[PDB]
Amino acid sequence: GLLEGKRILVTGIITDSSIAFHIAKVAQEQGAELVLTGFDRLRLIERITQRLPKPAPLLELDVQNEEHLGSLAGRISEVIGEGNKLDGVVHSIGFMPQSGMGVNPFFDAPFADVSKGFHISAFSYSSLAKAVLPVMNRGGSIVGMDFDPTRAMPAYNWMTVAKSALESVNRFVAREAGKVGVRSNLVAAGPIRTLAMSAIVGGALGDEAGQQMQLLEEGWDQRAPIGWDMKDPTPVAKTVCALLSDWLPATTGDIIFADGGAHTQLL
Amino acid sequence: GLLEGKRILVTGIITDSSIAFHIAKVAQEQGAELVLTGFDRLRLIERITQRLPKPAPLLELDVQNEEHLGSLAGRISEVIGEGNKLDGVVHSIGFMPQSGMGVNPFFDAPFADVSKGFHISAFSYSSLAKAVLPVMNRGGSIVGMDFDPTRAMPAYNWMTVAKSALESVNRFVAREAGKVGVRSNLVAAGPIRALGDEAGQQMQLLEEGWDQRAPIGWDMKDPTPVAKTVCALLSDWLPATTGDIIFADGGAHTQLL
Amino acid sequence: MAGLLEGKRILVTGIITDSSIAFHIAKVAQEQGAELVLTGFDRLRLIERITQRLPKPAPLLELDVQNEEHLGSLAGRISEVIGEGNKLDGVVHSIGFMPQSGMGVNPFFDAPFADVSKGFHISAFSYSSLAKAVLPVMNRGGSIVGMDFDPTRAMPAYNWMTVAKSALESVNRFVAREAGKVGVRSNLVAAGPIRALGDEAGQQMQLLEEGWDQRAPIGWDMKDPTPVAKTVCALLSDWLPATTGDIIFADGGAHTQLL
Amino acid sequence: GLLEGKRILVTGIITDSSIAFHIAKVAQEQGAELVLTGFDRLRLIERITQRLPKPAPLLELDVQNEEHLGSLAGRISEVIGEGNKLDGVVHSIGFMPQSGMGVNPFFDAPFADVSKGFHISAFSYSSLAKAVLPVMNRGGSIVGMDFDPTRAMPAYNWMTVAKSALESVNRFVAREAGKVGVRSNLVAAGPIRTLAMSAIVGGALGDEAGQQMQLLEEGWDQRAPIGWDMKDPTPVAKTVCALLSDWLPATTGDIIFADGGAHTQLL
């Protein structure tokens, strides 16, 4: 197994289509022992995580809660055994209030909303690292999820800005984590299609992206030299696990693209 | 002159060594008609602006105050005349609480501090653009100030994160401004200069690298090259540049050593 | 009413027709008060007739940028034009050539090395050659500007010319090092694209090039060379005095947007 | 093994200090079956490759020789078995005549020298791909070696230009290789110290880098959040094998940095 004997904390599992779910699934298939986090309705998280290959303990973590963050290392140690430390941490937490996205005018997003999206999506990558580094092994690896924000694009709007900030945070976290031998990297994934139910009785599932976002996302498979399957999270999950492994041991503060090569081409 | 007849709003004048002061000075030397803004130390700013080549009116603007922002377009029109519009706007406001700029470890900066610095240094570029675009002419130019955040650096810490955010914001402001024919760009400037302390010492050592790297050298005591570059972007001579970042750093960022 | 380049002496390469971007660079420069020296090699008689359509007279020197004798004599021949006590303030490299095998008339892999090397020579290496030849007669504070087409991403048809432009960007950063020793700046302008027997490569390029106006926040007019010409003149001026080794985009903002 | 059952062609083994030697070593340790190339003193290359963990056939390949390139596929099929194809190809070929490097003035490099370095160091990445793609499996991987040329630097001079060209070539090779399901990527390695002998009777080993290049290379360990060991090729060799594996399956046209994180930091 690529991650045999490694102990890995995975944040961000909300549904069975959360990219963190597939990261967790591949890591377990590759021999890792997981610790999972959730915040709201832990019982509902427990139901999803019971669909993973192997059991895994669930810890409560609201990344905006300094008390949760302050106690996390000790709660991790309780569950993995006090002599043991983590080898990997996955940050898969991204959120921006809807006023900051979609067809809401970019200029109309209230600061309070954008600040919260910045907190959850970018600042919390630093918060999580600070919280977990005291219980990580030398040579360990922290990986966060990115969506390339180098160029502006329709709909992604202020979430793009939060990802630009996240990329910058990642470089400082790598500086801090490196002092104790830990790597920090982001995976810039191509778009993965997400379904959500209409919030009404009789509701059905349907694509979350609106028209403009869908048109934007369909460009990836057109551009990607090896194509891009928006319904397939597995290549992204494998890439995260590559960074959690010891096979990129000299990469840190960096961004690895799992996007079919789309960002390298222009049509 | 380079900006002959252009009406330009300049934010960020604090002292007569502020880069905004030198931007305003060069712009007036090049024929611009200015409107200035201030908030903190507003009487002091009026005194400072008397040292400019020419007088200019001053409007109060706290870029965190949505009432100040919503009234700004009407207040500008009152100053310049209701049938006239601005051709240029300069965003030269950067603030990050010291806890985000190296007086403590990176990890110790509290969110409330970093959020405020993000608000002032990144979000408000969008706020100001939203406020001014209704009174800007087609072909106009919004320019903000940047400090290259592509790589992490000693001490600059969360201000560098804010500037990465600002660069992203600029690309979206360009999208919105272009709908009415207005450009939006940043200038990535090189650094401009007993109780001294660690964060200041770290920044000093980092900043001395620019002159070492810059093929044409870098004078940390000379704001004029940066001010001239801003005026270039305010002029009609970069009419197809938007969403972009122009480096005024001696070429330091293009060289490894 | 001072012009942007008032009193400056500027050498301009690359004028082939009155549609050449170099023609428009020269035209705007003269409108802004510059005194020009022009160069040509192929179709010299044609170039002379073309250069007479510029606003003001300008002498024409022969320069094959692959000819080391032409390069080596260039500084002395410039001094004859402008006076031994005078120097140039600006130099424009607007020479790009890649044999058609490197620009999409056949698949990328089929381009022969000899063709690609020739295009590398003319489109990338000669930026360094020209700088070497002109710098001894350039003033401190002067400016060398070359023409770029953003090669950060692979594109249809442009193929090995894109590779040459990647190389050119790297050359520019090294020319900046050498030029900086005598106070001279070196930069590239990355321009957006400027416009029955139509053929495949041209069709691919047209479809690709129409995307600039779609992406550009301020639009992009492929029929209008003036914004690019002005941007070159901005770099030749004293208004970007701390920019060197760099790439300035004159593309409507298209490269900053995905859609 | 990370590369169990994979057939991989490795170019560029000159000495037992060539990065390609260490790539070949790790690939064999990870279960790969190799085919090796050489051009100069094939008997001397056979002697170097006998120190690899396992035997591997050696094929002659001058990448400037179109007859060598045109026959390469058939000569590969002969040695790996007529029904078989390659899963991986490593390009580790870089050369610039000395007039193009060091304390030679940048402006004094003759074009014929720079053209030759461009041919060997950049054009030949396309030539090798063209020659080997007919005998590569879908899902295969081509990996070339890079030294980050994003900024100019002392000494590296025209080789920097060649690497800039190589990066561009890699993005076009990715477009072409992707049509048959093959990825193409570069590894941008930190500097690896190289010793060479003075060309004199009684000669000794010493660093090939001149003063300015040594000062440049020494910055990596200072900048790198996890440090950078110029004497250790292994992290770079491992990163190449990561790209040859199936664990970065959606990465193509790209550049993976194995440099300790140094390019993400500024002092």
DSSP C210: T
CA-wise closest residue to B219 among B246, B250, B256: B250
Residue A2: CA count within 13 A, CB half-sphere:
28
Task: Find out whether D19 is annotated in a ligand binding site.
Answer: yes
User: Rg (Cα) of chain A, in Å, rounded?
Assistant: 18
Inter-residue contact B96 to B159 (CB < 8 Å): yes
Classify B110 as helix, strand or coil.
coil
Bridge partners (DSSP) of residue A141 are A88, A183
Inter-residue contact D244 to D206 (CB < 8 Å): no
Task: Find out whether A254 is annotated in a ligand binding site.
Answer: no
Task: Find out whether A112 is annotated in a ligand binding site.
Answer: no
**Hey, are the CB atoms on C258 and A215 less than 8 Å from each other?**
no
Task: Find out whether D196 is annotated in a ligand binding site.
Answer: yes
> Which distant-in-sequence residues (6+ apart) come within 8 Å of D195 by Cβ?
D17, D205, D206, D207, D208
Backbone angles phi, psi at C115, to 5 degrees: -70, -45
Which chains would you list as touching C if contact means 3+ CB atom pairs under 8 Å? Answer: A, B, D
- Interface with C, mutate which of B187, B213, B254 (most C CBs under 10 A): B254
Which chains would you list as touching D if contact means 3+ CB atom pairs under 8 Å? Answer: A, B, C
Q: Which chain A residue's Cα is nearest to C256?
A: A151
Paired sense of beta strands A7-10 and A86-91, if any: parallel
Distance of alpha carbon D226 from alpha carbon B135, whole angstroms: 51
Distance, in angstroms, between D186 CA and closest chain A CA?
12
Four-residue CA torsion sign, A152, A158, A161, A163: negative
Q: Which chain B residue's Cα is nearest to D263?
A: B151
DSSP string computed for D24-50: HHHHHHTT-EEEEEE-S-HHHHHHHHT
Inter-residue contact D225 to D156 (CB < 8 Å): no
**Hey, are the CB atoms on B238 and C250 less than 8 Å from each other?**
yes
Distance of alpha carbon C116 from alpha carbon D118, whole angstroms: 10
| CA-to-CA dists, residue B92 to A13, B145, B146, angstroms | 41, 6, 9
Backbone angles phi, psi at C231, to 5 degrees: -65, -40
Residue listed under structure tokens 């044409």 = B216
Alpha carbon D192 to its chain centroid, in Å, reads 13
Write out chain C residues lying below 8 Å of D151, CB-based: 173
Distance of alpha carbon D197 from alpha carbon D72, whole angstroms: 33
Distance of alpha carbon B195 from alpha carbon B191, whole angstroms: 21
CA-wise closest residue to C148 among C131, C166, C130, C121: C166
Residue C64: CA count within 13 A, CB half-sphere:
7
**Hey, are the CB atoms on A261 and D253 less than 8 Å from each other?**
yes
Q: CB count, 10 Å around CB of D120?
A: 20
Residue listed under structure tokens 């299609």 = A193
Backbone angles phi, psi at A78, to 5 degrees: -60, -40
**Hey, are the CB atoms on A178 and D224 less than 8 Å from each other?**
yes
Distance of alpha carbon D156 from alpha carbon C11, whole angstroms: 30
Distance of alpha carbon D163 from alpha carbon A266, whole angstroms: 21
Give the per-residue SS3 of chain A: CCCCCCEEEECCCCCCCCHHHHHHHHHHHCCCEEEEEECCCHHHHHHHHCCCCCCCCEEECCCCCHHHHHHHHHHHHHHHCCCCCEEEEEECCCCCCHHHCCCCCHHHCCHHHHHHHHHHHHHHHHHHHHHHHHHEEEEEEEEEEECCCCCECCCCHHHHHHHHHHHHHHHHHHHHHHCCCCEEEEEEECCCCCEEECCCCCCCEEECCCHHHHHHHHHHHHHCCCCCCCCCCHHHHHHHHHHHCCCCCCCCCEEEEECCCHHHECC
> Which distant-in-sequence residues (6+ apart) come within 8 Å of C133 by Cβ?
C71, C72, C74, C75
DSSP B33: E
Distance of alpha carbon D71 from alpha carbon D65, whole angstroms: 10
Residue ranges of chain C whose CB lies within 8 Å of a chain A CB: 153-156, 207-208, 211, 255-259
**Hey, are the CB atoms on A261 and D245 less than 8 Å from each other?**
no
Residue ranges of chain D whose CB lies within 8 Å of a chain C CB: 64, 105-107, 111, 114-115, 118-119, 122-123, 126-127, 129-130, 149, 151-152, 157, 160-165, 167-169, 171-172, 174-176, 253
User: Rg (Cα) of chain D, in Å, rounded?
Assistant: 18
Question: Which two structure tokens, joined as six digits, stand for D225?
Answer: 């959040």
Distance, in angstroms, between C200 CA and closest chain B CA?
29
CA-wise closest residue to A185 among A135, A124, A125: A125
> Which distant-in-sequence residues (6+ apart) come within 8 Å of C158 by Cβ?
C103, C104, C149, C151, C205, C208
Inter-residue contact C58 to C23 (CB < 8 Å): no
Classify B155 as helix, strand or coil.
coil
**Hey, are the CB atoms on D175 and A257 less than 8 Å from each other?**
no
Distance of alpha carbon D168 from alpha carbon C168, whole angstroms: 11
Task: Find out whether C183 is annotated in a ligand binding site.
Answer: no
Residue listed under structure tokens 């080391």 = C68
Backbone angles phi, psi at D59, to 5 degrees: -115, 145
Selecting from D152, D165, D172 the residue whose C-beta is nearest the C-beta of C108 gives D172
The one-letter code for the residue type at C214 is: Q
Question: Which two structure tokens, joined as six digits, stand for A242?
Answer: 């590559």
Burial B46-67 (b: 16+ CB within 10 A, else e): eebbeebeeebebbebebbeee
Bridge partners (DSSP) of residue C43 are C41
The one-letter code for the residue type at D84 is: N
Task: Find out whether B43 is annotated in a ligand binding site.
Answer: no
Distance of alpha carbon C169 from alpha carbon C127, whole angstroms: 10
Gaps after residue numbers in chain B (C–N over 2.5 angstroms): 193
CA-wise closest residue to A27 among A261, A262, A245: A245
Q: Which chain C residue's Cα is nearest to A155?
A: C259
Bridge partners (DSSP) of residue A145 are A187
Inter-residue contact A240 to D264 (CB < 8 Å): no
Backbone angles phi, psi at C255, to 5 degrees: -75, -5
Write out chain C residues lying below 8 Å of A154, CB-based: 259
Distance, in angstroms, between B107 CA and closest chain C CA?
32
Inter-residue contact A32 to A242 (CB < 8 Å): no
User: Rg (Cα) of chain C, in Å, rounded?
Assistant: 18
Distance of alpha carbon B208 from alpha carbon A250, whole angstroms: 29
CA-wise closest residue to D141 among D69, D243, D72: D243
Inter-residue contact D35 to D56 (CB < 8 Å): yes
| CA-to-CA dists, residue C212 to A25, A240, C19, C223, C254, angstroms | 42, 34, 20, 12, 5
Selecting from A154, A263, A264 the residue whose C-beta is nearest the C-beta of C259 gives A154
| CA-to-CA dists, residue B177 to B10, B183, B242, B246, C232, angstroms | 18, 6, 9, 18, 24
How is chain C split among helix, strand and coil, in percent rounded to 5?
Answer: 45, 20, 35
Bridge partners (DSSP) of residue A205 are A197
Inter-residue contact B139 to B87 (CB < 8 Å): yes
- Interface with C, mutate which of D124, D172, D180, D252 (most C CBs under 10 A): D172
Residue listed under structure tokens 């400027």 = C194
> Which distant-in-sequence residues (6+ apart) come within 8 Å of D75 by Cβ?
D59
Four-residue CA torsion sign, C22, C27, C28, C32: positive
Classify D183 as helix, strand or coil.
strand
Distance, in angstroms, between C74 CA and closest chain D CA?
15
Sheet architecture: strand order including A183-189: A58-60, A33-38, A7-10, A86-91, A136-146, A183-189, A254-258
Q: Which chain D residue's Cα is nearest to A248?
A: D239
Four-residue CA torsion sign, A129, A133, A135, A136: positive
Write out chain B residues lying below 8 Å of A122, CB-based: 161
Paired sense of beta strands B136-146 and C246-250, if any: unpaired
Inter-residue contact B235 to B183 (CB < 8 Å): no
DSSP D9: E
Bridge partners (DSSP) of residue B248 are B189
Which chains would you list as touching B if contact means 3+ CB atom pairs under 8 Å? Answer: A, C, D
> Which distant-in-sequence residues (6+ apart) come within 8 Å of B6 by Cβ?
B27, B31, B32, B33, B87, B88, B234, B235
Alpha helices (runs of H) in D30-156, residue ranges in sequence order:
42-49, 66-80, 111-118, 124-132
> Which distant-in-sequence residues (6+ apart) come within 8 Å of A11 by Cβ?
A20, A36, A37, A61, A63, A89, A90, A91, A92, A93, A128
Classify C222 as helix, strand or coil.
coil
Selecting from B106, B152, B164 the residue whose C-beta is nearest the C-beta of A253 gives B152
Residue listed under structure tokens 């950049």 = D122
Distance of alpha carbon C216 from alpha carbon A148, whole angstroms: 19
